[model samples]
Target chain A: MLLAIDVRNTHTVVGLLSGMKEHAKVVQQWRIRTESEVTADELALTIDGLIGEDSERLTGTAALSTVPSVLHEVRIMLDQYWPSVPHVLIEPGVRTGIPLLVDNPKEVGADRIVNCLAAYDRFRKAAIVVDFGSSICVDVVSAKGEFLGGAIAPGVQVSSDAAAARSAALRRVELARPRSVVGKNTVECMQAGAVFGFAGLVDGLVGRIREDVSGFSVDHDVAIVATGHTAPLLLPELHTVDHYDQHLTLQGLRLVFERNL
Target chain B: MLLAIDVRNTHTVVGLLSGMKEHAKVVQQWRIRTESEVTADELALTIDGLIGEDSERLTGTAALSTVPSVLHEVRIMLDQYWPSVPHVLIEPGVRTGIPLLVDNPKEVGADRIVNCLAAYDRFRKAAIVVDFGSSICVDVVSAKGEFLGGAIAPGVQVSSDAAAARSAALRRVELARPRSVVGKNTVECMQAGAVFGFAGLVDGLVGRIREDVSGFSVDHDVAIVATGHTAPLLLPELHTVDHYDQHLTLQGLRLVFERNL
Candidate 1:
């Protein structure tokens, strides 16, 4: 069994990659909060509890994290608990076989690299991977396999929360898709703004990226793939999104693990 | 002579309607920070300093505030300083002349009301008042001269701040129009998302509102008017904006005073 961990600012997901000789799948997946103060031992214990006695069956592990402090703790967890096992930390030094076009490859995030690799590998054409995690990030991979840069925006939830805090007229409401775009009431208005507004924001950004990249239409030529938890909300409103793969990061980690170690 | 003060979440604008003989003009307009805990006397003193000696020349004062506590202090300032003046607050009891169609009209902010009034009065046609203040609000008036509802989204600055807070990868950047929509670097990427993404968000929300109210195309018959402080950043990107009026709210305040007082 192989383990893959993807860490974001708000959440961390761990998966056990299994079914070697048959149709492979992430046998078990666990999503947990990414606490800033959580120690290495605490994380190791949580992972231990998740896999339980199957911990001994773990052959290899690969991890990708965005938060630096949290990444430090993950490193500690790996050192303390899995010293004998083959483990890999996907970072700047990692062997990701993706062509680089960014200013400095060191500034490129490991998760972004994973997303670009996965998106390009799957599509084998110009593609964009929209990762809707803590912050909404849209990363692009060129037709020639170069890692072209993309845009980032505040997530709908956090942006709407900020709006509510900034105005006395605004009140917190459930982040749901409103029945119609032209809202009837206050709550419905907010819902429309957050859900449909975000969808529109994404289309504009993505549409521009597509045009700038190759003058290709975003929906027809360039494949738009969405991942992460919040992607579902904006996916329905986007004609550009060709597919939605929730565990693209984990799958990318598995591929990297196989190629490297 | 009259004074018009429009209060918002962050700042207050004070204008002096001077020279009563020939078409009274707002000779001066001052924008000052709003103290959340300032007393009524302190505000009156500040106003007195702005209109010095000319303060006694004021015959009437009209005001509209989005903040409740701020509005309370403003009222106190009126009572203690200039009680004899004919003053009007665009609240529930005030006569706006504009058809009140919003459900539970008191829930609407006075700023939003003023914007709707100003835009509708000028255009006399279907129009949307996009106020970019603490939050970016899109309020609508129907072609039939009815106060239809609108949408609200986070301001670009606060929304960008929220994005930085939610992700370690992002940093504070001067929110400017990037050279290209597809950013080459981090700052440009954030700029693209903030500038273009917000433009897209407004289009979608406004488009929906346009379609809902009389099924008129957003850009064709329905005039889109941009107001508030931050509207300039997105005005060029948006083709829907028919006009950009800096003093729409203040203009509305003057109009309301004319009818009511």
Candidate 2:
């Protein structure tokens, strides 16, 4: 078993992979609030809590992070406890078969690249991967599985939080699909705007991205996939989205981990 | 001349109308940060500073406020310093003749009603008003000129601010139209999402509102207008929006002033 972790500023997602060989599949996953100051012991204990009685199955771990401070703790946790296990920490020089074709290769986010790799690996085609996490990232991959760059949009929850905090009368409402776009009441109206509105945001980016990809510029051969926890909120309304893979990064991490091994 | 004041969560926007009440012309306008602790004396001085030597020409005042404490100061300021000047404060009883068609009429924001009145006065028909301020509000008026309810989304600036604050790697970029939707660089990507993404948000609401209007199901006559400091950032890309009114609330306040006096 391989433990794959992707740490974002707001939350860290952990996925447990069952096989290291062909058709490596995710068996389970966990999501917890990201802690910047987590110690190695604390992190190890948390991992133990997650995979209790199944720790022996964890033969290796693969990690990628947006939060550097937490990544430092992850490094310590791996060294202090799981040092004997094969580990892959994806960073600047990490070996991933997908080519980063951006203006500056180092500037592309590791998690974004992971999503692109996972998208192309699963679909085996040109694709647009929209990740709805702490930040909404729309990454583009060529039909040849090359990283062709992407767009970064405000995430749904963060945008909703900002709106709720800034407006004196408005309060944060639980996110759910509204019946119609033009809401008859305040809560439903906010829900409509937050949900249906973001679908437009995703479609707008996807359409423009599909038009801008290197090859297949005028065709519909490209697959559009969405990942991250909030994908479901917009997936139903996202007209262009073709698939919703919840653990794309974790799946990609497994691929990266095997290459390093 | 009458002073038309719009108190928002962030800024207290003031517009000065010169000439007769029968045909009031908005000659000048100013937007300052709103204050809660401001006293009547401070509020009077602020207004006086705006008018300067023209204070004697100010015959009346009108206001629609979102900030409650600042409104208290406004009332005392008008009563104590400009008692002779006729004043109108828009609420349930204060009338500009725009009927509120929502289930709970008073639940509507004062600024929203002000926009409806101002839009009706200018266009003389059914319309949709999009406000880009502390909260982005989309208000609809029927063909019969009644205030139908609308949707509310997170404001662009506030949403971007939240995204920046939450993402350790992301920073707030100066709001602008990015060169392309699929930005090549980080700053450009953020700019693209912050700007182009929001344009999609406004358009989404506008499209839904246009569809939900009481009449003119197939026609394109329903006037769509955008108001607020940030509206211009989105107006160019908003396909459905017809007009961009910079101070629609203040202009509406001017009409409300004449109605009371």
Candidate 3:
């Protein structure tokens, strides 16, 4: 068994993986708020609490964090808590087979690269990975599994939070499909915009990205993969995504762990 | 000359209208940061400073504020400083000649109704008014010039601010069109998402709103008006908007003042 963790600005996702090679998959997963002040010992304790009986069975661990402070803590947690277990911390020097094709390779987010690797590894084709996290990232990968840089938009929740915080008259509402595109009230109005409007943002960006991808004259040949926690919210209305793999990051971490092994 | 004021969550727009009837248009305008705590005296002072030599020549004052606290101050400013000058405060009771066709008429933002009136007044047709401010409101007005509700999304600046605030690695970047849809770095990535992604959002939302408008079989006949301070940022990319009227809300306020008289 292997433990995989993904730390984002807002939340941390922990997954327990089972099996090996072609059969390896996440058997269980949990999501908790990511606190930057959390100590390495606290992280280990939380992991133990979640993993429970599986803690002793864990052979290896893999993790990545987009939050810099949390990223530092995660590296320390791995060293202090699970030093004996072979672990892969996805940072600048990780040995992922996917090539980073951006101007500054180091600037590409660790999680984004992990997502790009996972999508390309599965499809083995030109792909667009849209990860809906604290920030919505739409990353492109070549047919050869090279990391082609992509767009990053503010996530739906964060954008909504900003709107509510800035506007005295507006406040956060439940994020669900509204009664109609043209809302009859404030709640419905915001709901329509967040869900349907975001779907448009995704579809439109994907269309342009598809057109801009160098090869694949058809453009339809390229796979559009949706991942991360917020991906499910936009999935129903999103026209561009071909696949929804919720644990793509965890899956990618598993792949990275094997590569290091 | 008529003074028209539009107080929004982030900024307040003050405009001076010249001429009359068909030729009446904004002669001068200024955008200032909206502060809720600013007293009526301060409001009057700010307006006086902006209007300058024309302050004494003002015939009437018309204004609306989405912020509740500022809305109160605005009314007081009109009473204390320009009591002799006829004023129209666009609250629930104001006669704008446009019918509100929503569940709760007063639930709609003052700026939204103002935008709807301005768009419909000019086109005299079914219109979709997209106002980009602290929030992005896509309002629909029927052929009869009735306010038929709308969608509200987070504004570009606020969303960018939220992203920068939340992410440790990410920071605010200059908003502009990127070299390509595929970004080469963090700045370009964010720029592409803010510009192209938002354009896609407007186009997509407009497409849906047009289809749902009921009367327009052709949909193309329905006028799409882009308004507010942030409209220019998206005008170059937005395909739906037929007209870019920067002073739509101010124009609406001017029209409202005349109707009251």
lDDT per residue (tens digit) for residues B1-261 in model 1: 789998888789898765433254667788998777888989998989888887778888989888888889988888789987888876643468777676667677788778888788788888788888777778878877777777777788889988887776778888788888667677877888889889888877776666665646735587788987778888888856778988888778887887786
Better of 1 and 2 by lDDT: 2
Off by over 4 Å in 2: A92-95, A212-220, B20-22, B92-94, B212-216
What is the TM-score of each predicted model, taking all chains together? 0.92, 0.94, 0.97
What DockQ would you assign to candidate 1? 0.67
- Per-model interface RMSD values are 1.6, 1.7, 0.9
lDDT of 2 by residue, A1-261 (tens): 888989987889887999765678899899988887888898899988987777776789999998777888888898888777888787743448898876778877789889988888888988888999888898888878887777888888888878877766677898998777766667877898788778777877777676655564655588888898988877877777888898789888988888788
Clashing pairs in 3: none
TM-score: the better of candidates 2 and 3 = 3
Candidate of highest DockQ? 3
**The candidate that achieves the highest lDDT relative to the unseen native structure:** 3
Per-residue lDDT tens digits of candidate 2, residues B1-261? 778888888888888888764466779988888886878898778878887887788788887777777777788777888777788776643466988777667667788888998898889888888889977888888877888778888888888888888877777678888887777788888888887778877776677666655473547588888889988777887787888888688778877776767
Candidate 2 chain B weakest ten by summed lDDT:
B209-218
Candidate 2 colliding pairs, count = 0
Which regions in candidate 3 have their CA more than 4 angstroms from the true location? Answer: A216-220, B217-220
**Could you tell me which residue pairs clash in candidate 2?**
none
lDDT tens per residue, model 3, B1-261: 999888888888889998777799999999999997998999888888888889788888888988888889888888888877888888753578899888888778888888888888899998889999888999988889998888999888899889988887888687777889999889899989988888888888888787765875363478888987767887888887789988888888877777778
Please give the distance, in angstroms, between residue A49's alpha carbon in candidate 2 and its true position after superposition.
1.9
TM-score of chain A in every predicted structure: 0.91, 0.95, 0.95
